[PDB]
Amino acid sequence: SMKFIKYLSTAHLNYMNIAVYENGSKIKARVENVVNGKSVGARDFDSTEQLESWFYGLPGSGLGRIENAMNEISRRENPLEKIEEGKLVIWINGDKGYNGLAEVGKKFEKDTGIKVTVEHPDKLEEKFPQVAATGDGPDIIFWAHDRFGGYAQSGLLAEITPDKAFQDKLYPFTWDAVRYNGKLIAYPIAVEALSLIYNKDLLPNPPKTWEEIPALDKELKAKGKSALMFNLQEPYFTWPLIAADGGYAFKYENGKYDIKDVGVDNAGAKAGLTFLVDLIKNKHMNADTDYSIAEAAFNKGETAMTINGPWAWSNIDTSKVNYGVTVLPTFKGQPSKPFVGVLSAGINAASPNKELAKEFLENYLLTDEGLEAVNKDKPLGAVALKSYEEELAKDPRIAATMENAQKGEIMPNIPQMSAFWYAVRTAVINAASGRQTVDEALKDAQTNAAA
């Protein structure tokens, strides 16, 4: 879906260039490190013609104009469309099929004359609670369900009330993910869980255990390859290893979560992160690997494995790597325990388009045809819609997604999940980079999560 076409500049500036991709039916241009593929920024374009007209229209010339292009593409991507009556503004994260969703918007616009804009503003899930509070932001926000309880607690979300027959179309556990204080606060879309992704040409049988990875990396470095690369910057990707042997966010009792019973600093969590840091101290992995570096390395056949969600699969299809999707490795004999997210669509309490939003979500998006259009852009994984899931469940990659999900946990949607994530992210980066030891990083994470 992300298919490389060319570098824009004939000469690399400071080992940076602008990588131009065919992105489904659109174009994406990224400011990339030409050595490790690290992406510094990106913007979408309708077509190569629009890309060039934009580029030929920038100030400067020669390499100076490339630089200006890089500065424009690499600066923060801010919300552009403002809420208006008779329009829908949608925010969804940049790794999801937002062009497919826009196509669902076009079906809505054809039927109703209401235009539907889709954006992926940077840090949309942080921008939302600050601007929706004051009447701005989008009509509809997409994120995994863990963010939504914080939003609901602050009054930022309309209560959603699909009728019983609509509720019967989605799996009951996906409704539970978006239930907060006895109210539905979002429409569940898809069920996400990390899986192990491996190159069958480098690795016909993936390791069952994390403990095999150091030896695997040893023999692959000899052939100039890596065993495993994945995004070390976001705790979502490292959590499954941290949870495997006992780590948890909040203990869920008979009825509720106990925000005072935090488990980011127990023996299991310490063991998982220690194994992670040991991979780095032994140079099997690099503390600076982010999402783009790992993706580029795996899709070019430089590393035998990665850890990612379904939103990444079609990029690998395009790369033509002979890949498999399978259950995460065990740690200490215990299954890796990924946090399961339910991609969910909430309606802004400040939206003046609440009935149009409901109509868009229920009768356009949450249909076999609507989800397929999104899925064709970036795969959704398992979907909350039973009719569509029963067809997707025949795909072994979906079966593997659900196996990892079943070995994991649905994320809590309580307000403090935000604090938990921020604390675990700081703990992993500090332990990975050697700014802190494992024990002292997880001790601080313990503190920051429960406050």
Ligand X SMILES: OC[C@H]1O[C@H](O[C@H]2[C@H](O)[C@@H](O)[C@@H](O[C@H]3[C@H](O)[C@@H](O)[C@@H](O[C@H]4[C@H](O)[C@@H](O)[C@@H](O)O[C@@H]4CO)O[C@@H]3CO)O[C@@H]2CO)[C@H](O)[C@@H](O)[C@@H]1O
In the numeric block, the tokens 């100076």 are attached to: 64
Q: By C-beta, is 37 or 341 nearer to ligand X?
A: 341
Specify the residue, 21 or 339, whose C-beta has the smaller distance to ligand X. 339
Choose between 18 and 294: whose C-beta lies nearer to ligand X: 294
> Smallest distance, Å, CB 226 to ligand X?
21
Mark residues 298-317: x for contact with ligand X by CB under 6 A, - for none: -----------x--------
Q: Tell me the closest approach of the beta carbon of residue 147 to ligand X, in angstroms.
A: 5
Paired sense of beta strands 87-91 and 140-144, if any: parallel
Backbone angles phi, psi at 100, to 5 degrees: -60, -45
* Spatial distance between the Cα atoms of 418 and 381, rounded to a whole number of angstroms: 24
Nearest CB to ligand X, comparing residues 138 and 235: 235
SS3 196: strand
| Of positions 97, 100, 207, 235, contacts ligand X by CB under 6 A | 235
Amino acid at 201: D
State the DSSP H helix or E strand holding residue 395, giving kind and residue range, or none if neither.
none
Burial of 114 (0-12, 13-18, 19+ CB in 10 A): middle
Please name the amino acid found at residue 208: K
Q: Nearest approach, Cβ of 82 to ligand X (angstroms)?
A: 22
32, 146, 217, 377: which one binds ligand X (CB under 6 A) = 146
Q: Which stretch binds ligand X (CB under 6 A): 71-79, 266-274, 371-379, 420-428?
A: 420-428
Give yes or no for residue 337 binding ligand X (CB under 6 A).
no
425 is an interface residue for ligand X by CB under 6 A? yes
Three-class secondary structure of residue 159 per DSSP? coil
Among 31, 66, 140, 144, binds ligand X (CB under 6 A): 144
Is there binding between residue 93 and ligand X (CB under 6 A)?
A: yes
Q: Contact region for ligand X (CB under 6 A) — 20-28, 233-241, 282-290, 368-376?
A: 233-241
Only segment of 60-68, 266-274, 416-424, 441-449 that touches ligand X (CB under 6 A): 416-424
How many CB atoms lie under 10 A from the CB of residue 146?
A: 25
DSSP state of 29: E
How many CB atoms are closer than 10 A to CB 214? Answer: 16
Q: Measured from the CB atom, is 32 or 125 closer to ligand X?
A: 125
Smallest distance from the beta carbon of 280 to ligand X, in angstroms? 18
Looking at beta carbons only, is 234 or 395 nearer to ligand X? 234
Q: For residue 435, give both structure tokens.
A: 């700014």
Check binding of 234 to ligand X (CB under 6 A).
Answer: yes
Binding mask 244-283 for ligand X (x = CB under 6 A): ----------------------------------------
Q: How far is CA 72 from the centre of its chain?
A: 24
- Cβ atoms of 419 and 150 closer than 8 Å: no
d(CA 446, CA 451): 9
Of 226 and 238, CB closest to ligand X: 238
Residue number, 216 or 343, with CB nearest to ligand X: 343
Q: Which amino acid belongs to residue 300?
A: K
Asked if 147 touches ligand X (CB under 6 A), the answer is yes
Q: Does 379 help bind ligand X (rule: CB under 6 A)?
A: no
Amino acid at 199: N
Residue 251 has phi, psi (to 5 degrees) of -70, 125
Size of the site for ligand X (CB under 6 A): 18
Using CA atoms, how far apart are residues 157 and 160, in angstroms rounded to an integer? 9
Q: Are 345 and 187 in contact (CB under 8 A)?
A: yes
* Candidate segments 12-20, 142-150, 371-379, 440-448, binder of ligand X by CB under 6 A: 142-150
Closest contact distance (angstroms) between CB of 428 and ligand X is 9
Phi, psi (5° rounding) for residue 293? Answer: -60, -50
CA 340 – CA 358 distance, rounded (Å): 25
Q: Does 126 bind ligand X (CB under 6 A)?
A: yes
User: How far apart (Å, rounded) are the C-alpha atoms in residues 405 and 278?
Assistant: 26
Which residues of this protein are in contact with ligand X, per CB under 6 A? 93, 95, 123, 125-126, 144, 146-147, 192, 234-236, 309, 341, 418, 421-422, 425
